[PDB]
Ligand binder design. Structure first.
Ligand code: HEM
Ligand code: HEM
Lengths: 727, 727
């Protein structure tokens, strides 16, 4: 019975459509022609559905899937009902342990390709040829919250990429800020317990704004650098497409001659950098907790494929000790003003998964998964990471055969003498399960290291020292990097940093914790320290006002690449506008609006005070995407109000509020014809104001003004005007 | 090191304190003297900390917990560092699968006591004497969301009680609505999959507002009854303390004479019934995803112990077929106007756990866990539940010995011949591990059924019919209960239901699903259906307008017990008021305000534009709990603005917004003296309006008027006035 509508509107068209135009769907159904070698190898396990009989897991067709088997229709359920018991058993056992950290994350498939061969600095096969494509799977995530926590919380973001290379899987497991909070892996559990929900009551979810986090931070000043990044707008990116990615650690590149070059990995978002503002981001955790997940998935369904440029910071082995910070300390960044990022390749994510659980939830990334041509360093954080990912995956994924879970399998050959383990898929036919063996003529065999297709050999780094549990003295500097970061931010970015700390610390119950954090800020920058103190009603002592600021980092008083916005990099393709309709829309305005949006690849969402349709003045029937309250201004990049019967919406509280919120959150607003009467709601200017586009009608000029504002992301100059507004 | 403040302010006092006054803490440190038998029996596994050396799990003291062992202070981490490896290993394996459903929950310890012996109707030992105290552990929960999802989502709530009786554990696993969505347990995986995040992209979290839910509901009209309850304000309770609880299924009570009586279990909230309004709930999911968890914990830390009355709907075996609905159908309620709830006992929750993971996360509740004196019925949803809880716990809790996890252990004796299994704690000394045996003289032995302390014997219900997979034809009625519920609601409740369906259907992307649900609403009630259809821009057809309304339920055209608010039952103790300060508060107003709240057990939170202190007009120093933006109006029940230097906050956007939000969400507001300048902000006439308390000062009847308003929970008369207002 219960079947599809006659018109076939239950099923999404298999072509790129704008967000909200069609029901989203499994990637292989939405984009059947989008392929890559990894995507294709997953076909052995894909399972369709159309035209097949419903069955048990043993293949027995089910006749009645609505009822348990009972002795009489009002009788007891019988134990012999094996259909019911398999069905309920499988349901009872759906859940697997979520990731210890980064449990909340969203992933997609794609491909990578280098711009040119890097064979002079590395023998890694995936970086050796500009026309040799490597399939990728990328998972972006938050850090602290559970798998069901919200996307747009304040947090560091993970950015993990699995490269299915010809010589093995390479996972580049990084974050959206260039440093981590702590120096040695031994303190990981300590840092993570402090930022996670407090042990007695398991509060708060997905947030650092609570006593144990600020306690830990105040007692461990090595965390201040990453805490500055987290409190800036870097902790609340607008989308996974508009954030940077970094491997943080110094790794090594090894070429065919055996030369080692120190390397730091970067991803540059080709959609530019952009973040939300705090109030918007926190409200968005309530209006749409899956905002980033949704936005990623929709951009891929729309053809706005997230694109990132892989880049390398390269430091010759002889310059190991030439900075004023240790290269092996993960709480220290390498300023691009000192070591520029060399462009290496492009990564495009062009296909969503079919099943979230099977591919996203069971994906396993590990910074230890390297290939010939790459090698580690002694960074003490990285070092302990090599132990942990392998270990956690044995319980998370139920045993040691997690490499056999479809998303995790290499697409290149894998042969060895490992056998058995829970849920073993691979049936080995080798007569031998050990080497050396003569009965299989010693196959599979070891392969010497060499220029290409060779066996892995570690770089022979010289090791000299006593066995000690000791932090390197060169790691003992905690304030100059925080200060460099502060000084490179724009004034409005600095304010947002002050506000992040003031908000967070105001949720710290124990007041001495607040004071101690303020004291640490005083070691970074007195202006910052005083601005946070003032918000906390704290007064800096005379001693605190005399703390000398830390030294510059190798002569640097600022580095503009550390700011999200000092260097313009705005891109409107893939952004979205809210269009507030009225019941007699002036079609001429809409037409002009939609044409200019379409030329720049900007999407639109048609909003009204009810769902269904409204008819424009020329008879055009406009389907309503959502209501004013149901898809808040939080979810769009700018707002446009066309003319028409404005009296229909002029007194609407949600419509008025829509604009006050957009205004407060510094988004571009454009008002045509009688829509300019809404200017009194956002109680400001009569001759106009930068950030508000206005005209008798929506024209070419009106739309260029709006699109230019959109390209600068937000109206920073409006900051001074928003704190009187009641929104 | 000795890191605590010398003042001792890192430590909350071990005495009842109001919410926000001190840092919250593990139950046994916060209320050491609050004991019960179960709480005392857990003392064997409680672990302290103070004054102990830091060790490995094997008892080896640790010297340096800040660093890994390496070959040189900048060298590689050594494999021999067993301290690092045990520490990271335990951390790496901290997580366990979350519950398949009801993963998000909050729990507490308490005790139960019956009002009088129920021996005439049940031989259940915990109900046989009013001086017999049974320890309980209760967990309240949402349904769909992960363990990290938000508290205040729209959803049914779970209400599970573990009774540690002298004759066994009895778990009463119910919800906050008297019926469930589906009739037979075979469809649980289908219903649950439909309500959970859609499989391709795992969106949306914690919400039924999406296509698959509404698709399922529109094809399975048996769900409408519970969908009505979920769409009403029942789905967004103000707190776990202000909601009702139900067992849902008909069970049996068996007395010593062998007589079976049918029973439905109810829990009445002694704090009264209270819910939020949708906008507030939704916004609260972002501002504080742990609002319910927090309120429960702080209520118990303040002495506002959540209290519930256990009540029984009793129906003689002879009346099984006397109703319009089948008693064994879980989608049907038993109208209290037909069968009154008989008061049975009182449950008081008076202590939080010590460790959320250990006690809450690992608690295992199961409706099949009954004791002599109770028995099941053939309700087909219940019948399948009896299989599921046992099964799911083998994987969630790691094996068949989950009854040995401290929180789950019986306080009464348990002895049998079961052995081994993962994580086996009990070391059995019985020479025999089988019965009958002669080698231990057959111990432990079976015990015949009897009036007290006898063995379990099922009631000998007659069974008759063929082995069939068949829904009873008596279950095929889907619309009269939904209609009864609808007609029992106040007019503002009906509107809220209409708004729930409207908002939810507005997030369904496929319009035909919205149409199909509207067609189903039209079989319940025309006014409901038309109002929802209008909100969706849908017109009912002439046939839909002529669908005949379903019959009354046994002559009833309404039952006021089904409404949250038709019959006042307001209780103010434990509610919280926001006090908006200024920098020279009339201290006379504040003294009047604070004393009056305290007299009724009403808590207060002093708010301002910054943290720190402000000084009242007489020099009283006032400590600030949070900012206007930091503890939004969503988290209080009422707002009071005292006189002083109102010009200080008159133009504060946040202060103004605070009132707008509280006014929009129907909360009582009280403005003293010059605080009445805020009337313009919320458009209050000069003459005033019901719901707004205003006077020249906070003396006389000012606090009595505000407290009368708090007792009625919200100002429903204000609904029409909020329609407009931009907030
Ligand atoms: C620079 C420092 C670090 C970065 C950039 C980082 C990044 C990440 C990312 C992006 C993920 C999620 C991968 C996914 O999407 O599945 C992750 C997970 C994880 N991280 Fe790291 N992390 C860092 C430090 C550490 C440390 C020091 C440890 C422990 C010694 C650690 C242990 C883990 C574990 C156990 C997981 C879960 C892996 C799984 O369950 O498969 N992380 N980390
Ligand atoms: C009258 C209908 C139902 C009610 C009132 C109900 C209530 C609940 C509650 C309150 C919980 C959470 C317990 C806790 O806090 O740990 C729960 C969990 C659960 N429910 Fe039920 N449920 C119902 C129907 C069902 C059905 C039909 C099934 C499957 C046949 C089912 C399977 C489960 C499972 C597997 C869990 C997780 C338990 C665990 O992991 O320990 N429920 N249910």
């Amino acid at each position: 019975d219960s079947l599809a509508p006659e018109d076939g509107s239950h099923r999404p068209a298999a072509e790129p459509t704008p967000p909200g135009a069609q029901p989203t769907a499994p990637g292989s159904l939405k984009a059947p022609d989008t392929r890559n070698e990894k995507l294709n190898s997953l076909e052995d396990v894909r399972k369709g559905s159309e035209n097949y009989a419903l069955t048990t897991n043993q293949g027995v067709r089910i006749a009645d899937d609505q009822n348990s088997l009972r002795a009489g229709s009002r009788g007891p359920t019988l134990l012999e009902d094996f259909i019911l018991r398999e069905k309920i058993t499988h349901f009872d056992h759906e859940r697997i342990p979520e990731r210890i950290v980064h449990a909340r994350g969203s992933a997609a498939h794609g491909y990578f390709q280098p711009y040119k061969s890097l064979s002079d600095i590395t023998k890694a096969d995936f970086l050796s040829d500009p026309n040799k494509i490597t399939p990728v799977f990328v998972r972006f995530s938050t850090v602290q919250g559970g798998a069901g926590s919200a996307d747009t919380v304040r947090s560091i973001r993970g950015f993990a990429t699995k490269f299915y290379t010809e010589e093995g899987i390479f996972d580049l497991v990084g974050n959206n800020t260039p440093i981590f909070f702590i120096q040695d892996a031994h303190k990981f559990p300590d840092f993570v317990h402090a930022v996670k929900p407090e042990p007695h009551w398991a509060i708060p979810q997905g947030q650092s704004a609570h006593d144990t986090f600020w306690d830990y931070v105040s007692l461990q000043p090595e965390t201040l650098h990453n805490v500055m990044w987290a409190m800036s707008d870097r902790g609340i990116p607008r989308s996974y497409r508009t954030m940077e990615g970094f491997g943080i650690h110094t790794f090594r590149l090894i070429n065919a001659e055996g030369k080692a070059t120190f390397v730091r990995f970067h991803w540059k978002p080709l959609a530019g950098k952009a973040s939300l503002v705090w109030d918007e981001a926190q409200k968005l955790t309530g209006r749409d907790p899956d905002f980033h997940r949704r936005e990623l998935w929709e951009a891929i369904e729309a053809g706005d494929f997230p694109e990132y440029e892989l880049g390398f910071q390269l430091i010759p082995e002889e310059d190991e000790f030439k900075f004023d910070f240790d290269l092996l300390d993960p709480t220290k960044l390498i300023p691009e003003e000192l070591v520029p990022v060399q462009r290496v390749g492009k990564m495009v994510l062009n296909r969503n998964p079919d099943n979230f659980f099977a591919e996203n939830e069971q994906a396993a990334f590990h910074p230890g998964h390297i290939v010939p041509g790459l090698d580690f360093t002694n960074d003490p954080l990285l070092q302990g990471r090599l132990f942990s990912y392998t270990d956690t995956q044995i319980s998370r994924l139920g045993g040691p055969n997690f490499h056999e879970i479809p998303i995790n399998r290499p697409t290149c050959p894998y042969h060895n003498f490992q056998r058995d383990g829970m849920h073993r898929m691979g049936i080995d036919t080798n007569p031998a399960n050990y080497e050396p063996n003569s009965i299989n003529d010693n196959w599979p065999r070891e392969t010497p290291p060499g220029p290409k297709r060779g066996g892995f050999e570690s770089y022979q780094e010289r090791v000299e020292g006593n066995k000690v549990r000791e932090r390197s003295p060169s790691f003992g500097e905690y304030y100059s990097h925080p200060r460099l970061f502060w000084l490179s931010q724009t004034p409005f970015e600095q304010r947002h940093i002050v506000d992040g700390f003031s908000f967070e610390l105001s949720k710290v119950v124990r007041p001495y914790i607040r004071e101690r954090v303020v004291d640490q800020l005083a070691h970074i920058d007195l202006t910052l320290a005083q601005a946070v103190a003032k918000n906390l009603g704290i007064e800096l002592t005379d001693d605190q006002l005399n703390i000398t600021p830390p030294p510059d980092v190798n002569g640097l008083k600022k580095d503009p690449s550390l700011s999200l916005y000092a260097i313009p990099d705005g891109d409107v393709k893939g952004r979205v506008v809210a269009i507030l309709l009225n019941d007699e829309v002036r079609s001429a305005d809409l037409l002009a609006i939609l044409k200019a949006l379409k030329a720049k690849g900007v999407h639109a969402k048609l909003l009204y005070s009810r769902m269904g349709e409204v008819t424009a003045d020329d008879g055009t029937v406009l389907p309503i995407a959502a209501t004013f309250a149901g898809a808040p201004s939080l979810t769009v990049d700018a707002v446009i109000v066309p003319c028409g019967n404005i009296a229909d919406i002029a007194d609407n509280g949600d419509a008025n509020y829509y604009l006050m919120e957009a205004y407060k959150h510094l988004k571009p607003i454009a008002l045509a014809g009688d829509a300019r009467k809404f200017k009194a709601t956002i109680k400001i200017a009569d001759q106009g104001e930068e950030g508000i586009v206005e005209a008798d009608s929506a024209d070419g000029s009106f739309m260029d003004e709006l699109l230019t504002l959109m390209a600068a992301h937000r109206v920073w100059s409006r900051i001074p005007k928003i704190d009187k507004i009641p929104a």
